[PDB]
Amino acid sequence: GIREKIKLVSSAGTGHFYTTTKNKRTKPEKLELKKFDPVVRQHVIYKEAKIK
Amino acid sequence: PKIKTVRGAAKRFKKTGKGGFKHKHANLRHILTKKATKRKRHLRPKAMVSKGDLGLVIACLPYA
Amino acid sequence: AGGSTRNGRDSEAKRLGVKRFGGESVLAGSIIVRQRGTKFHAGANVGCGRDHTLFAKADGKVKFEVKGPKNRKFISIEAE
Amino acid sequence: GFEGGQMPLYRRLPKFGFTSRKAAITAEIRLSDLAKVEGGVVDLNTLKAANIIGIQIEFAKVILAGEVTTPVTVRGLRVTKGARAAIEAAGGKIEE
RNA sequence: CUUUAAUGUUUGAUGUUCUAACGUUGACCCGUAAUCCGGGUUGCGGACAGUGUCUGGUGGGUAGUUUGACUGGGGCGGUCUCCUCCUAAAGAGUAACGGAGGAGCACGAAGGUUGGCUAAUCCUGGUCGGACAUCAGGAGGUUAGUGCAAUGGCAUAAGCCAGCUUGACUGCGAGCGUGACGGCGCGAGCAGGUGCGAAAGCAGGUCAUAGUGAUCCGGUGGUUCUGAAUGGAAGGGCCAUC
RNA sequence: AAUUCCUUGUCGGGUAAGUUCCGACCUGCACGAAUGGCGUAAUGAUGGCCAGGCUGUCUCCACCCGAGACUCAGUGAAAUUGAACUCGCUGUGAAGAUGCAGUGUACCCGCGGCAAGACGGAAAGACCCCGUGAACCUUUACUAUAGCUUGACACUGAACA
RNA sequence: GUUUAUUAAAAACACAGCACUGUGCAAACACGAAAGUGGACGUAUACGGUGUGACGCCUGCCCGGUGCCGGAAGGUUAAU
RNA sequence: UGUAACGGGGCUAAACCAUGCACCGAAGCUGCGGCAGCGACGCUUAUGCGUUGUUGGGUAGGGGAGCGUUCUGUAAGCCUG
RNA sequence: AGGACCGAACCGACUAAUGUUGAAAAAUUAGCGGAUGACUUGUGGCUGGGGGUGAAAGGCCAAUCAAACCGGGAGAUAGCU
RNA sequence: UUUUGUAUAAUGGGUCAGCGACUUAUAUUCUGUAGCAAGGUUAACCGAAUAGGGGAGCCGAAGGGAAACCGAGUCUUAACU
RNA sequence: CCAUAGGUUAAUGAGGCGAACCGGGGGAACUGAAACAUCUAAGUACCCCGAGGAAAAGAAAUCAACCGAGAUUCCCCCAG
Numbered sequence A: 001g002i003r004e005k006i007k008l009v010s011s012a013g014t015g016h017f018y019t020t021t022k023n024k025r026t027k028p029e030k031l032e033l034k035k036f037d038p039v040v041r042q043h044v045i046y047k048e049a050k051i052k
Numbered sequence B: 001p002k003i004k005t006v007r008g009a010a011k012r013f014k015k016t017g018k019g020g021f022k023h024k025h026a027n028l029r030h031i032l033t034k035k036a037t038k039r040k041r042h043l044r045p046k047a048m049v050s051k052g053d054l055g056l057v058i059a060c061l062p063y064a
Numbered sequence C: 001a002g003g004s005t006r007n008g009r010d011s012e013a014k015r016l017g018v019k020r021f022g023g024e025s026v027l028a029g030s031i032i033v034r035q036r037g038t039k040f041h042a043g044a045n046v047g048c049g050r051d052h053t054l055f056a057k058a059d060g061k062v063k064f065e066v067k068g069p070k071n072r073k074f075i076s077i078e079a080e
Numbered sequence D: 001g002f003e004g005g006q007m008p009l010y011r012r013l014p015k016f017g018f019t020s021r022k023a024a025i026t027a028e029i030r031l032s033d034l035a036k037v038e039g040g041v042v043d044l045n046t047l048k049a050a051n052i053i054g055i056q057i058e059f060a061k062v063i064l065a066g067e068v069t070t071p072v073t074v075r076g077l078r079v080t081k082g083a084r085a086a087i088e089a090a091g092g093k094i095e096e
Numbered sequence E: 001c002u003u004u005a006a007u008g009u010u011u012g013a014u015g016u017u018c019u020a021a022c023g024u025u026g027a028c029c030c031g032u033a034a035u036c037c038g039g040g041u042u043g044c045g046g047a048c049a050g051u052g053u054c055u056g057g058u059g060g061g062u063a064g065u066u067u068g069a070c071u072g073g074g075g076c077g078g079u080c081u082c083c084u085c086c087u088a089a090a091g092a093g094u095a096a097c098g099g100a101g102g103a104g105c106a107c108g109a110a111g112g113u114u115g116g117c118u119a120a121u122c123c124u125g126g127u128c129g130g131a132c133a134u135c136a137g138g139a140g141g142u143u144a145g146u147g148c149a150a151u152g153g154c155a156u157a158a159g160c161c162a163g164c165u166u167g168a169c170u171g172c173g174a175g176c177g178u179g180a181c182g183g184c185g186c187g188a189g190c191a192g193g194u195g196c197g198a199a200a201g202c203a204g205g206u207c208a209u210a211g212u213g214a215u216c217c218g219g220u221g222g223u224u225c226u227g228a229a230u231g232g233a234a235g236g237g238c239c240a241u242c
Numbered sequence F: 001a002a003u004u005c006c007u008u009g010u011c012g013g014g015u016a017a018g019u020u021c022c023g024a025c026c027u028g029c030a031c032g033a034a035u036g037g038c039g040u041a042a043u044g045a046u047g048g049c050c051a052g053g054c055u056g057u058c059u060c061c062a063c064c065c066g067a068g069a070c071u072c073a074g075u076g077a078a079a080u081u082g083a084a085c086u087c088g089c090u091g092u093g094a095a096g097a098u099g100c101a102g103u104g105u106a107c108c109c110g111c112g113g114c115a116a117g118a119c120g121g122a123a124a125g126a127c128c129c130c131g132u133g134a135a136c137c138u139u140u141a142c143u144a145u146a147g148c149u150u151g152a153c154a155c156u157g158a159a160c161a
Numbered sequence G: 001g002u003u004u005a006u007u008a009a010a011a012a013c014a015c016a017g018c019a020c021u022g023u024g025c026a027a028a029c030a031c032g033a034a035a036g037u038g039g040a041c042g043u044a045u046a047c048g049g050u051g052u053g054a055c056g057c058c059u060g061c062c063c064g065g066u067g068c069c070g071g072a073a074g075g076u077u078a079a080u
Numbered sequence H: 001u002g003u004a005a006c007g008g009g010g011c012u013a014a015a016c017c018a019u020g021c022a023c024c025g026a027a028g029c030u031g032c033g034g035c036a037g038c039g040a041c042g043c044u045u046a047u048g049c050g051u052u053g054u055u056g057g058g059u060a061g062g063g064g065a066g067c068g069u070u071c072u073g074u075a076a077g078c079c080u081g
Numbered sequence I: 001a002g003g004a005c006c007g008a009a010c011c012g013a014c015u016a017a018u019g020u021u022g023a024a025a026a027a028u029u030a031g032c033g034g035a036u037g038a039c040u041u042g043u044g045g046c047u048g049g050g051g052g053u054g055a056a057a058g059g060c061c062a063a064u065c066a067a068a069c070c071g072g073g074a075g076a077u078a079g080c081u
Numbered sequence J: 001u002u003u004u005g006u007a008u009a010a011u012g013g014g015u016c017a018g019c020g021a022c023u024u025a026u027a028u029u030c031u032g033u034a035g036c037a038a039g040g041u042u043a044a045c046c047g048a049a050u051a052g053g054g055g056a057g058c059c060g061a062a063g064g065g066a067a068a069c070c071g072a073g074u075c076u077u078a079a080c081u
Numbered sequence K: 001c002c003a004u005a006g007g008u009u010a011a012u013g014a015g016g017c018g019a020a021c022c023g024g025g026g027g028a029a030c031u032g033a034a035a036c037a038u039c040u041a042a043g044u045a046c047c048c049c050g051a052g053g054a055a056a057a058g059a060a061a062u063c064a065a066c067c068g069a070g071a072u073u074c075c076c077c078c079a080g
């Protein structure tokens, strides 16, 4: 279970977040995906943040 | 003496109009990133208590 | 006293099979077949699920039939 | 609730919600209760005198249930839409 | 400021001595006709010791308890959840300490879409080069492949390449399947917003079936929903999540 | 070997013959030096072995003396007990029959004796298992704790460096 | 010599002796919430505990583990 | 332990095979009589009265209807030297 | 002189037989050990229950002891019979 | 009685007579029955008193939602075919 | 030294018993939790002290909620 879990924070200013997993050993670079933000009702770039 | 209410069931169940009991679904408290969103979406709304396990609730909740 | 084993296991029965047979009127969305592969195939007004589950897209009677050059088994919903 | 040692339903299942203290001091009123007061005016103190809502009550709504056949002044209470129409049709005067 | 002198007090540490607390199971006197006690003189010690509260350590000296089930008797050994096949008697289901194998993950591409492609093995010829690298033709026709076990599937490929990308979307969900229940599963379609494609259309993770853990308690972000005189706040609730 | 599983180890002695004994060997399953090692005179209601004497221990029992047992008179229990008109055999059958089936045998009732059976009597098996029973005991099981110990503050002050 | 009164008198316990160790006296220790008492009207040739068990010859190697003793430079560490 | 491997006696069929007609044989079926339950149907319910079918083994257990006892009222009544 | 010897009282209890609803809820008969000593015995006293005492057997503490007896919590609990 | 199952050689009872085991209280639900009926009902207490008073209260006639709140609708959701 | 401690007389009072109720100082466990340790049982049982015919408490540094109430004690509700 080396594949740790992270969260994809909206870059729309909302504190909305998707949660997911990654292998930080093999993918050290940050994950950036364009996902839907249901508060703004737009597709916004989410960025990887810590699950905390 | 009066019957005493099982206070956990009183914190977990509510009587509806026709006498049924509503309750929250389980499995929605943690471990939530691996579960599909469809599953969670079908777990947010309250559900009715089934006919089989409705007798134990009525026995625990005599005062509605 | 003595012995052991290594063969005690088995899994639960998934309750596959054909839930509604031919000439049997169904509603839309009714599961017809649960299956692993495409042992059957989806014909008219019949969808194939994520797990190769065959469900009805419409209402009507079930029709089993063999088509194609490979003699594969298709399931269709006749209109009614 | 004992199911053997199986975890009973009231512990498998989660707690939810909280209890509103304000709900204990709110009340709902039929339209049929409006005739039981005297004077044709409806307050909290009038309803409490008519023994309808209770003493500790501080809020009350009037709900479309039953029917009223007399003009009644409603004062200081919330009114639903159907009760507002029925009161105003029977001659009432909803105020604050 | 870097690098610091005077004076003084606020004061701690460490000794140094003292006596007045305190101790004396040292001597003497009196109560007293008394090896208790108390008082008095004195000597020694002396703010130590010793007691109270707090606190760390040790503590079977003592006490309260726990120390699983299945089981061709019990123990020992093995097992306990999930997946696949057989047993299973041509729907489903079906037991044994019955026969055989696996799982407790992985992937930001190994997903989506568009476009295209089609294996294994062997034969012959051919530089290093050889049973076996790469190359060309032929047979063959999936005997291969499928991220991993097995089974069922797979050519319209679900298999293999490349381009663009994030539908590995949010709210819902007719209707069914499966379970005693908790619960688990399939799902067209609707609304919003998106990707690929000329378009029809497809996409709500992966060919499917294992890859998991209730509740409580607690943590994090968001949300005025609540807010014990009032305004806030704490706390709680709801949504997401650990 | 109070220790040796294999083991009645092997050899010797003793005996007609000795799984025991004694003495040796050492291949010590798994002795060993103050949870003492090896010896040791005396002692021991101590353990093992041998011999002499003795003898009913026995070969193999016989007779006798007394106390009961037996009979009469007097007093007069007990455990136990579903009810009894309470045989054998073979078979059957909750799987070992007085009671069933088939068959055989047997006039009714006592007394003295024996004890094969009545799965005889006695004691809700002590073995075994179970119980989310108990008790006691142990410990580097868990949680506590007396006790011992550390330091802080108080009772507790004055000076000088 | 003692012992399981009532199935075990023994090879078991004890014993004189030996050794280790603690204890400086208001002794250690023990009974006691405490006062006190025993130790002991005794003072290390004494007292307590532990093991061994007359006598004779002896008592070998290991301090890694667990304990105990001693150390106090450093690390960590409570209340405050 | 005693024949003791047809239930026994006994059987040369009183065994076996085939075919056939008889008969025995159960608390089964039928007959006669009687009780009760549930349904029909009609009455005209005293809410039950005919007819009618049919049912009636039963543990745990569920349901329904009753007997009797002691005491209180009815009862300063009634029975009783 | 002697925790010396033999051996009665006295103290004890090694063996056998009897008895085992006994004469006896541990004894009798025949033998047995110590018998001036760590002896034995009379009277009175003291130690109290997780406590005493114990030449140590988990022995004894009123015919009861791996925690006495009496009363109470108490109608403990008993998924067992 | 317990049992898959007992003539069982499984338990229990020597016999008789007497006693001897599903109760009581308060809450709650269902059924029946009775009273009133969108209403029903009082408790404490007063009262000389099983009356009457007493409606404090309780249940019911409206729900949904965690809640504010809305209300024959409401919640979910930006919004629901 | 005074003094004080102490001594002696005298006067008044107390002491002990007793059913329950009462206030207070101490204070269990079985049990239940289907085990058990927090918890429960339960401030119960028990022990002790003191009092009265009753005791205790008691005349707001109280509640309320921007309206107001007006010591204590007891009962029915609130409300499982």
Ligand SMILES: [Mg+2]
Pocket (backbone or CB within 6 Å): B028, B029
């Ligand atoms: Mg949550």
Ligand SMILES: [Mg+2]
Pocket (backbone or CB within 6 Å): D005
């Ligand atoms: Mg469990």
Ligand SMILES: [Mg+2]
Pocket (backbone or CB within 6 Å): D051, D052, D054
């Ligand atoms: Mg009212």
Ligand SMILES: [Mg+2]
Pocket (backbone or CB within 6 Å): none
């Ligand atoms: Mg213990």
Ligand SMILES: [Mg+2]
Pocket (backbone or CB within 6 Å): none
């Ligand atoms: Mg306990």
Ligand SMILES: [Mg+2]
Pocket (backbone or CB within 6 Å): none
């Ligand atoms: Mg077991």
Ligand SMILES: [Mg+2]
Pocket (backbone or CB within 6 Å): none
């Ligand atoms: Mg076994």
Ligand SMILES: [Mg+2]
Pocket (backbone or CB within 6 Å): none
């Ligand atoms: Mg099948």
Ligand SMILES: [Mg+2]
Pocket (backbone or CB within 6 Å): E089
């Ligand atoms: Mg079948």
Ligand SMILES: [Mg+2]
Pocket (backbone or CB within 6 Å): E110
């Ligand atoms: Mg793939």
Ligand SMILES: [Mg+2]
Pocket (backbone or CB within 6 Å): none
């Ligand atoms: Mg394609």
Ligand SMILES: [Mg+2]
Pocket (backbone or CB within 6 Å): none
């Ligand atoms: Mg080649």
Ligand SMILES: [Mg+2]
Pocket (backbone or CB within 6 Å): none
């Ligand atoms: Mg796969």
Ligand SMILES: [Mg+2]
Pocket (backbone or CB within 6 Å): E216
């Ligand atoms: Mg918990």
Ligand SMILES: [Mg+2]
Pocket (backbone or CB within 6 Å): E227
């Ligand atoms: Mg506030």
Ligand SMILES: [Mg+2]
Pocket (backbone or CB within 6 Å): none
């Ligand atoms: Mg607010």
